[PDB]
Amino acid sequence: RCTTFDDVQAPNYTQHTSSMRGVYYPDEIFRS
Amino acid sequence: GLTGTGVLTPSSKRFQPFQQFGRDVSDFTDSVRDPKTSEILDISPCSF
């Protein structure tokens, strides 16, 4: 059922900074 | 998934739980994780 409300206001697509994030482990092999 | 020839020994690792292999600073194996709950080093140069 398409139960959809009315107060859906669009933002300004507010720009920010992702300065040092997104770093992860590229594979499942230990190094040191 | 690994064969070779080595001298095994108990480690001093801080091995993460999601993990299975233990390669060194310059891409060689040097430590492994046993499939029945052990984490042993792999000094594969027996002697040469």
From Swiss-Prot, chain B:
Changing S47A: In strain: Isolate Tor2 and Isolate Shanghai QXC1. Attaches the virion to the cell membrane by interacting with host receptor, initiating the infection. Binding to human ACE2 and CLEC4M/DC-SIGNR receptors and internalization of the virus into the endosomes of the host cell induces conformational changes in the S glycoprotein. Proteolysis by cathepsin CTSL may unmask the fusion peptide of S2 and activate membrane fusion within endosomes. This is Spike protein S1. The lineage of its organism: Viruses, Riboviria, Orthornavirae, Pisuviricota, Pisoniviricetes. The gene is S. The chain holds residues 531 to 578 of 1255 of the full protein.
